[PDB]
Amino acid sequence: GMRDISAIDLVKEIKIGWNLGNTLDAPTETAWGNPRTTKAMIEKVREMGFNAVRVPVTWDTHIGPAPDYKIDEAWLNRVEEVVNYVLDCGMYAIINLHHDNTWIIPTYANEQRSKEKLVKVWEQIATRFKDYDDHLLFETMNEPREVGSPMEWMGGTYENRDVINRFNLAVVNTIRASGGNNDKRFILVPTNAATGLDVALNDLVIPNNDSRVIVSIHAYSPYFFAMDVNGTSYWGSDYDKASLTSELDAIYNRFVKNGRAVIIGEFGTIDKNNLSSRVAHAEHYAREAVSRGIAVFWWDNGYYNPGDAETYALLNRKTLSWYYPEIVQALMRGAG
């Protein structure tokens, strides 16, 4: 089930993906308004041209007490069931550990406590999925960071980034020792908050220089157009186009060009009654990333309410239709 394929070629194959957002990353699958996931939803995702689904998973409340930190089996089974929805559709799948920043605390004081817990949780996760083929990928952590800290969303301190390297190392060794195909499974790792900021990336170290490790970056660029409800609603100027291109070149010249694969696991825009800008923005984003060998995954939290904050949804899950197929088609145009 494990091809002789380099990470760089695997990521080119992945190309364009979709996040099952606000779902298993929620305290319970339906807690943030999304319906219980079905294979039918995933099929629609595949039907539109996506080649991969990222399945963010928050484990927090399903984790038993120390010292064993046993994961509730029912939760782990459900995670496995949804992963199979994706794989059965012939798509790639990524699972992670998402909003677990409550117990994953990247400071020197809390390093050993988190790391030990991080090791015992990943042992169980890696083990359950050890026999899956190379279409399943593990992402060590989502957006590891010191929550509530001054530098939280600005790359963190060296302390933060330093600890995160060891968290990653511990998870990577743990996966690699868990048997089955885990010696050869591809693994995504981020630095603080999965930022793409260059001076932060300076301190990222690839665990064991493992050749099947992929840089994980999240980039909702440009921030004001994409995330901020009070930001501008237009995107499309010559400056907008040159800007993201220059951002990708930085990523391409630093990693890809030298044989390190990169996945942009999250990007997207909210609904600001500005379809035309979103459609243009979406196409340029996929074209430029994929022409650089970078795979991109849209953030879809299932939330639709035009003009409101956090309105990233493309798929209408309860009705199996698309709110904005125009955006989906734009992505596909770009990825080619």
Curated annotation (Swiss-Prot):
One of its GO terms (molecular function) is cellulose binding. In the N-terminal section; belongs to the glycosyl hydrolase 5 (cellulase A) family. In the C-terminal section; belongs to the carbohydrate esterase 2 (CE2) family. Disulfide bonds: none annotated. The keyword Heme does not apply. Residues 1-304 are annotated as: Cellulase. Contains an N-terminal module that displays cellulase activity (CtCel5C), a central type I dockerin module (Doc) that facilitates the integration of the enzyme into the cellulosome, and a C-terminal module, CtCE2, which displays dual activities: it catalyzes the deacetylation of plant polysaccharides and also potentiates the activity of its appended cellulase catalytic module through its non-catalytic cellulose binding function. GO terms for biological process: cellulose catabolic process; glucomannan catabolic process; xylan catabolic process. Keywords: Calcium, Carbohydrate metabolism, Cellulose degradation, Glycosidase, Hydrolase, Metal-binding, Multifunctional enzyme, Polysaccharide degradation, Secreted, Signal. GO terms for cellular component: extracellular region. The chain holds residues 51 to 386 of 814 of the full protein. It is found in: Secreted. Multifunctional enzyme involved in the degradation of plant cell wall polysaccharides. Displays endoglucanase activity against carboxymethyl cellulose (CMC) and barley beta-glucan. Also catalyzes the deacetylation of acetylated birchwood xylan and glucomannan, with a preference for the latter, and of the synthetic substrate 4-nitrophenyl acetate (4-NPAc). This is Cellulase/esterase CelE. The active site is at E143, E266.
